[PDB]
Design a protein around this ligand. Structure first.
Ligand code: NA
Ligand code: NA
Ligand code: NA
Ligand code: NA
Lengths: 445, 445
């Protein structure tokens, strides 16, 4: 009766169809049928991301691909727990109020200029999206954006005030491309190809360093009239209280180990998922120091995303076990040989940066990383590059809303116009496809 | 500075002491020190139950007992997912309103007698604790219990009105001993020895059948003046609305497979953790049927308990890998050989039924189930008996509060007196040790 209710039934039919008509070895048919089924569900999202993810293992088990416990073990992957540390790390400095004090101590640095205001709102958003989330950083930033945009409230000066709204929403997504925690897509890559925190930072951090300015400039060089305006510093001051230094200290300590995991771990015996152990040690320190209770983490934590990780890891394992990964690498063998690696990384980047416009960032990476990664292995190529690429290009949702939550968040402000974003993003999208392929090429040898 | 801050430090010292001074094989010292460390933290709860569970694997990895991913895989055990299905099954029919209509159509069947009133409050409380929880059944029941206790509202009629309060608080804990979902302890046992849903019902349901009257009778035949009073059935009725039948259908369908899982699965190819597959199919049915959103399930779900499941399983594996499980079976060889099995099951039953007074029901099973189970294995004994027993006897917290949350819930009403509960449970405790050993003995040959 509902829209989504139909996709699910249409998708069940599409699966039943592909299943009974594809003319290949059953193992490959099964993998192809499953892949199409999930690919639709995750891209239309007729069912919640996590429900689809939970559907992966239950399918693999009934179709004899794996035994129940084998499939489920994907959900205990060490990266899933490193991402859980990121949440508890967030939950702490929010329940501590350390995220609000971070905004204030910065916005006061702008003595009163709207010029040095919106430009600080962008920087704060991207910085906070490195650790918290992207959807969460938007919701927590939007009021702070509408607050500053109330002295110069004249909305007939819209362009000063859609530049700020669209500015933060983009800063949230570009900030998430900075660290392994920040956006689910980044974790899906690390869990698929086994990346370290500092490994993904070698790639992501410089890219985010670059992409954030390139994105604001594009917004500036339309109708920016922000060189005018004044502030309305109405609010209670902040001050470092009980173990906000401790929390801030713990946090810094944790990020320190994450960055330096390589030598510290080697000089300790070479533990397995060292970054994961650090993330779990953070969860412990924060609780011994009493600075954050568990109910906080259970709320802050996105357990659906964690369940999702298991489904993508399970999906990747289904593609291999069924041989579908090699079956597809064959059908592309000629087509990809006609193409260089430049053409390859450029075609991929383009495909996702626009595919991610119609679906969630993570729901896109959840589907694309398993396929392209396992196929890249059939070609005997290291899936790091393609994976890292897809993870970054997935976070490049700038056109219409519905691409990322941060879009629909600043869009529900009833102030920015559909058409406006649809064309500012069409320019940014192209700028990224350029920047990405550039960086991707250099990140070759 | 804090009390718990002190227990944690006292426990940290005790480990350092035991570690450097105990004169046994290093692995056994490590296991013994770890076992004691965790045993204190879980029994004092200076740290949250779930925090401790995460503490197990991080230790096992740093002390070379396991590799990070091997240790972490414990948290993806199939039972953890079977309990997650229980949550989604609850969350659905609560957000659906299916739980209140059960009260009305039943509580209205009690036309108005306080005699047939308190006697119906007991049945509903225990019945809902079969699927939901024990802590949740108390909090969700207390208002509905205080409602009926307003006609004979005279607190000078205390005995009519403490019999009802303590009655439900006990019914919450006794109802959870009915099915595998209902109390974490039941799951902790099943996950340790790999029980099926219907298996634990063979034990738990009959045991629950008996214990509920034995507990009510004791309350009735003390200071009960409840045969008097009159009803005030005050509230707008409900009516079978949007997919409350669907929920009931899905729910009923799920429970049907659980009871008959044995033949259905055997007549299907012998899938591995069939009960787990059913639990996840419920999450799917509930989502395909649109009857509950994921935000709903993610809220209702107790993720801390799920992580705890992982911690106990990891702990059990630490006992074996270090040999501590067999080291203890040697120290008890004479003591236990000097004893019969009656002596064994009766000492065990008593030990927990009174131990569970000082710590959470689940926090107790988290510590005792791993130890007793792995030691029983070293003796070449099936760890089912002790586990089910310990799991069931662990849920028997009737005396003071702080034994179970359901106790502290009806107790914070500021009406029942420390001495009152402290002695009704002290008598009830003895009745159970009898009943348990009886049933436990009969469930032998
Ligand atoms: Na973030
Ligand atoms: Na997207
Ligand atoms: Na229950
Ligand atoms: Na207890």
């Amino acid at each position: 009766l509902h829209r989504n209710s139909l996709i699910v039934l249409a998708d069940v039919a599409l699966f039943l169809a592909l299943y009974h008509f594809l003319p290949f070895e059953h193992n490959v048919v099964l993998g192809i049928s499953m892949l199409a089924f999930i690919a639709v569900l995750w891209l239309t999202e007729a069912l919640h991301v996590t429900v689809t993810a939970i559907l992966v293992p239950v399918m693999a088990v009934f179709f004899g691909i794996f035994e129940t416990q084998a499939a489920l073990n994907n959900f205990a992957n060490s990266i899933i727990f490193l991402f859980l540390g990121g949440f508890a790390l967030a939950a702490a400095m929010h329940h501590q109020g350390l995220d609000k004090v971070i905004a204030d101590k910065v916005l006061a640095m702008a003595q009163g200029k709207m010029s040095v205001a919106v430009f600080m709102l962008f920087g704060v958003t991207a910085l906070l999206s490195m650790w918290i989330s992207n959807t969460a950083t938007a919701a927590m930033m939007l009021p702070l954006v509408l607050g500053v945009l109330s002295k110069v409230d004249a909305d007939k000066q819209r362009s000063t005030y859609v530049f700020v709204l669209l500015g933060v929403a983009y800063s949230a997504s570009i900030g998430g491309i900075a660290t392994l925690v920040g956006s689910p897509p980044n974790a899906i890559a690390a869990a698929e190809v086994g990346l370290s925190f500092t490994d993904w930072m070698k790639f992501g951090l410089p890219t985010a360093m670059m992409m954030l300015p390139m994105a604001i400039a594009i917004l500036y060089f339309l109708l920016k009239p922000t060189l005018n305006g004044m502030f309305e510093l109405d609010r209670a001051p902040v001050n470092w209280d009980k173990g906000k230094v401790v929390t801030l200290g713990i946090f810094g300590l944790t990020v320190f180990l994450w960055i330096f995991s390589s030598p510290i771990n080697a000089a300790l015996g070479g533990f397995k998922s060292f970054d994961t152990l650090v993330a779990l040690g953070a969860i412990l320190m924060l609780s011994f120091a009493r600075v954050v209770h568990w109910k906080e983490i259970q709320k802050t934590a996105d357990w659906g995303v964690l369940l999702l990780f298991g489904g993508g890891l399970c999906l990747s394992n289904v593609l291999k076990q069924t041989g579908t990964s090699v079956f597809l690498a064959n059908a592309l063998s000629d087509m990809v040989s006609h193409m260089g690696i430049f053409v390859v990384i450029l075609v991929v980047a383009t495909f996702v940066v626009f595919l991610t416009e119609f679906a969630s960032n993570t729901a896109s990476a959840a589907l694309l990383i398993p396929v392209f990664a396992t196929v890249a292995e059939a070609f005997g190529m290291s899936p790091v590059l393609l994976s890292v690429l897809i993870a970054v290009a997935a976070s490049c949702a700038f056109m219409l809303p519905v691409a990322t939550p941060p879009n629909a968040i600043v869009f529900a402000s009833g102030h920015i116009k559909q058409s406006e974003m649809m064309r500012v993003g069409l320019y940014l999208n192209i700028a990224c496809i350029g920047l990405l392929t550039a960086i991707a090429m250099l990140f070759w040898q």
